[PDB]
Design an enzyme around this catalytic site. Structure first.
Site, mmCIF file in Angstrom:
data_model
loop_
_atom_site.group_PDB
_atom_site.id
_atom_site.type_symbol
_atom_site.label_atom_id
_atom_site.label_comp_id
_atom_site.label_asym_id
_atom_site.label_seq_id
_atom_site.Cartn_x
_atom_site.Cartn_y
_atom_site.Cartn_z
ATOM 1 C CE1 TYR A 138 -3.251 2.972 0.669
ATOM 2 C CE2 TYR A 138 -3.311 2.418 2.986
ATOM 3 C CZ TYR A 138 -3.723 3.204 1.939
ATOM 4 O OH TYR A 138 -4.605 4.227 2.111
ATOM 5 C CE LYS A 167 -6.065 1.397 -0.329
ATOM 6 N NZ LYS A 167 -6.473 1.346 1.073
#
Ligand SMILES: N[C@@H](CCCC[NH3+])C(=O)O
Ligand SMILES: N[C@@H](CCCC[NH3+])C(=O)O
Ligand SMILES: N[C@@H](CCCC[NH3+])C(=O)O
Ligand SMILES: N[C@@H](CCCC[NH3+])C(=O)O
Ligand SMILES: [Ca+2]
Ligand SMILES: [Ca+2]
Ligand SMILES: [Ca+2]
Ligand SMILES: [Ca+2]
Lengths: 298, 299, 299, 298
Positions: A138, A167
């Site tokens: 992420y 992400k």
């Protein structure tokens, strides 16, 4: 075709009225509802779940409870198990393995600004602590204060086979394209931002880790389907357009203040946020309420 | 459906060896070449054409010459007639009308940082100075030092019916989507940046005002075609990918330094740039040359 | 010690009521007033003077007129003769030499984003076009869209002996300190921003090229004097504090919209600005008016 | 003249060879050395002390040990007791009170991006949890991802009488001047950045919370003295100039990677950093080493 699917919902964490305790019951039924409304996967105790103000125990119970709430379904349960301390991330990732969750989400370290080789070492050590547990990186510079480069991301996807997704919320389109070009198609690239889902699909993206899928999961699925499967970008965009006001409204104050307020207005008693997050203002609530009415949710 | 089409090339301005004179001859044949290689429209004497170091006379002759070079074709000729002075923009826009060009490109004022109502008045007055001449607005905060907002752009599209397009190079995706949502479908929204063409298509964009279409016009047409017409985003992206290194290479020094160097290497004698733009360095030329070879343009 | 002194006022350009003509008369008396109110030098037809909407002829007349308005005094008259075209900058600088002005101000090229070696070549050529005419560089990334680095600035100060000053408005404190550390003490480093004058004095700065010295010149002189000469930073800061609201007010809309509005309120009939600059809003005028009352300038 | 003085050193946290334990012994003698070399105060277990990778227990022991190392001197000991969770900050601040430290340092919440009224509530609650513990706010947008505005900072200084200082590292000079203008002169405004100390003095600043005072504390004192007391800004600047290369060198990689490397080169066995901070590169070490030689430190 990808383990975590097309729409992953970043679950809010319900609290009881005072904020002092988690409401595991509301967590269960909310997660079951998402599994039957287009969430292919759910992230538990990530940013939107108020990770920063949860204790580790609260997180571990939330993991266990959410995993049971969605047994029976194909909905994957992902532990928000990251940290800016590698030791803490390692401990949480091992706990997620022993609990039998489907994977972890691992944020780039926030606040302490590691070098790129530090980001790399951080994630190697975490991947090595549970080598058979799928992992979603992420990258969110706006919150962490650093950016994981294309090179670093690509190198990590090659070196650790349990790292299967990223992400990407930097909003950097060149970075996203370069990562996509150079990783294998089995590697998932997800938008970290509901407003960027559509343009990231154009650069090979596989979907979204969403806040708005609490409310419009099946419609986000339909958008991605029109774009990726059916060759109808005009219709994908028609859907993006229907929900731009809602996307804007969900971030007029810091996430998850609006997300939680919207859920409360729809009859989901998800409670307040914990300090330092304060209550939604009258002004932000009106913009949110209006956007929800126009989107057909009230 | 759109007057200016899908691919608009921002033409470089050829100079003779010292830089002192324009080479109108090389300008003609280069423009003819673009009209037969996927340019639906050409912008003359804009940023890529070294607008800042051209005199107004040089611009007016370039307009005349390029318009004749592409007679016979459907290729539209657009005057880079903008300025940070409204009076100067008005004069150049009137000259473009009297010359019979197909439209103008009008940059947001650079350097002097007008308020939003100033940007709006600037463009109203220019639209009013030749009300029958189609106009493409151009927003590029990185060069001008200010941003034309969504609100301003939308209001301008409603007020003035000759304002039919916007070249958006802010890279702001929310701004772009909002403008698209709120304008009529007859209003064209173009990427101002070869690297953003594909993602801006996903937000309703109609194409690109390109530097790289000097070299790969038909391939940029094919990318847009795959995406908008044929429902093949995978193939659109395969093309974007083939050319990312070339797109990077074209901006390793300020545009048009690499564009002009690439044209010289392909046998187009477009000359140097004028000061303050200096010659491409050996280092940037090597990166450019390598990117061109791998893209199948050279050796 | 320094040719251009401590306080240099960036003069507004008065226009008659429609904006169409310059009011050379109001220019004269305004410049005479500044020469008797702490302006050691005046810059004519720079940014604050609406350089972008003046023609070259208007500028040259303004230079002539302002030079005669201050003859007899030690007030130096500086031509805002910069451009994003080196050829145009060279022409204007030669005209400034032939007119007998005291020096030029030369902005980093705006809009066309030259490389650092381009900025360097641009200024070498300008310094060479009038080698005996003192020159003040002007670095303002917010308007030009590029930054002149410390290295480039220092190298220019060494290579060209008529380059004797720099107007630094990047707001970059490290850049400023490095330039100061490495140049000879005969080289002047000026703030380009009234709000930065005081902290730039702490890093060796020699004063300011100011907008607010139209109104509080002698107080800006007093501030610098307390800090540099008398060893009283506490008193320098007391003055900076008195005028922060005015400094903020002067930039709530783009300069010189507020500057001109303030002058009109004080009985200086300096006229409107020219498009694309629009009139000050009632809201900005009220904040300006209030700040001036509290500063003891009005009512 | 102010409670925390003019030069406050952000103490690095020594670790033993593996990184796994703190070296409390090296912490003691390093802190004693700083108290006799221009540190008017010391911050324990803040950013420079690798707060993010210390556990709470490690921090509490560091607080206890550093306080005893400097007993007998006028050197004040400040707990880096902040967090992006208000509950955690409250608990740490209470522990700091019971241990008898001189005050706390409290960072703006990092990563979770609270609204301004959240930042305000966060700090009110912490000030209220130990109303007789002096408190130094810390604004550092580049690490936290948000900025505490002038209005918020000023309002906090008025509401809570134990909030007596601000460490401002935004580099925003207007913000700094406005806070200074509007707070009482009893309120201390410190640069959070060695390179900004001098220009912030011109806008009413009271000194610096420094990394470089590990090495040149007495010289930083001399700079401030020349500027504020003796009316010699020319000499203040001569000193700033002597040390600009060292200031630049200390941040060529993220703090405290260079700080710790410099201390190791001076014979202080402060150990490595903890993941995700990796070792200094050969290139950064050479620039650091050169800057130290020219500054007369080796
Ligand atoms: N608030 C701290 C610790 C929380 C760990 C458990 N949620 C952080 O975000 O790093
Ligand atoms: N240097 C001026 C030239 C004006 C003529 C434009 N073709 C500019 O960049 O606007
Ligand atoms: N508008 C152009 C031309 C300036 C003419 C001379 N004052 C510019 O700002 O460069
Ligand atoms: N690593 C977590 C908790 C650390 C608590 C004690 N240093 C954070 O930075 O928020
Ligand atoms: Ca978590
Ligand atoms: Ca032009
Ligand atoms: Ca001028
Ligand atoms: Ca701490």
């Amino acid at each position: 075709k990808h383990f975590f699917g097309r729409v992953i919902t970043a679950l809010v964490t319900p609290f009881k009225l005072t904020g002092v305790e988690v409401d595991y019951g509301v967590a269960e039924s909310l997660a079951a509802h998402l599994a039957e409304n287009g969430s292919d996967a759910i992230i538990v105790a990530g940013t939107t779940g108020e990770s920063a103000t949860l204790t580790w125990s609260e997180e571990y119970e939330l993991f266990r409870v959410v995993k049971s709430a969605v047994a029976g379904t194909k909905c994957r349960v992902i532990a928000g198990a990251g940290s800016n301390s590698t030791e803490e991330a390692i401990e949480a990732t091992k706990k997620s393995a022993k609990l039998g969750l489907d994977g972890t989400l691992q944020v780039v370290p926030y606040y302490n600004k590691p070098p790129q080789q530090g980001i790399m070492a951080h994630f190697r050590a975490i991947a090595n602590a549970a080598p058979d547990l799928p992992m979603m990186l992420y990258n969110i510079p706006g919150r962490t204060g650093i950016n994981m480069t294309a090179e670093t991301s690509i190198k990590l996807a090659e070196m650790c086979p349990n790292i299967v997704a990223l992400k990407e919320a930097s909003g950097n389109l060149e970075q996203f394209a370069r990562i996509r070009r150079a990783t294998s198609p089995d590697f998932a690239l997800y938008s970290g931002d509901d407003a960027l889902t559509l343009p990231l699909l154009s650069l090979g993206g596989n979907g979204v880790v969403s806040v708005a899928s609490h409310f419009i999961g099946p419609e986000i699925q339909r958008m991605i389907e029109h774009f990726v499967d059916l060759g109808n970008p005009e219709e994908a965009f028609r859907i993006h357009c229907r929900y731009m006001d809602l996307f804007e409204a969900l971030f007029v104050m810091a996430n998850p203040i609006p997300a939680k307020a919207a859920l409360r207005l729809l009859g989901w008693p998800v409670g307040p946020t914990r300090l330092p997050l304060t209550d939604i203002t009258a002004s932000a609530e009106q913009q949110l309420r209006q956007a929800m009415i126009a989107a057909g949710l009230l």
